[PDB]
Symmetry: C3
Subunit: 120 residues, 3 copies
């Protein structure tokens, strides 16, 4: 009846990756008011659906972390992770760099130890 | 009970993965009826439970996908996926190749840029 | 006075992991009573969350496995699997090495072919 066809298939050699691209970039916002500090670290070009726990690591430059500034949120679908969080300025004292890490779950935890970071 | 036993473990010398072997093969079969085209493509040796989006790409190898010819399916558990579809023969009048890609999700974008391809 | 500072973050360079180190190690306690054998393989330093099928491979290394001894279990969040199994002694007669493997499914399956093995 209708014209048929039955081609055999052939593997391609350069099966290049597609989809979004891993290039950690970002801009932080350390807005400070009366005695609390809201911080909006907007990151882009991150990992499609990953967790990005970010806090304030004190001077130590692997040092201790004021864990009372943990912000946990997930990375959208193109790596558009937007972290936010309030912390009394008194706790913040002696913090030197806001380190962004990957997470193992929305319950904090540490997977990667410093994917992106900035002084203050 | 009356007899015990205690043995410390040793991690062998080399551990080898088993199950399916990623050997992409294929079998395209077109049957163009009255202003319509059915396409049953059988891919064996694929990735155990992956998505396999398939389209008819125009000339320009390289060139634009006729998006109205998408066929999507999963590869069972040994890497056997079967792609079926139905498209008017007027839209695929300039198709030069049927490119099979991997999928990111059920009905969605590509994760690769062509794993296996047959020339038409 | 909303003291606000905007800082661009650097893409880092040191991204070493943070969690269970895959270092397979453990012991075995095969205990015979009145014609039955109870085997307890407590492992540590394993994959954090993975099914670990373990059975008795006979002599022959390759060799068949008396599959009437498959001990299945999953690991915790540090990598601690506790395999436990009841097998008639007459069955495990002529067994040579208890081979632990990886489980593709809770139904069993040998993803890996021996991540750790103990001579019995």
């Amino acid at each position: 009846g209708p014209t048929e066809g039955t081609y055999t298939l052939a593997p391609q050699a350069v099966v290049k990756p597609a989809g979004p691209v891993y290039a950690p970039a970002g801009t932080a916002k350390i807005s400070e008011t009366l005695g609390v500090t809201r911080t909006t670290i907007t990151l882009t070009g991150m990992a499609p659906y990953a967790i990005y726990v970010a806090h304030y690591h004190k001077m130590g430059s692997d040092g201790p972390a004021i864990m009372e500034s943990r912000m946990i949120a997930q990375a959208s679908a193109d790596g558009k992770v937007t972290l936010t969080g309030i912390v009394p300025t008194a706790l913040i004292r002696d913090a030197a760099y806001i380190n962004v890490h990957h997470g193992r779950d929305f319950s904090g935890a540490l997977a990667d130890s410093g994917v992106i970071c900035t002084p203050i």
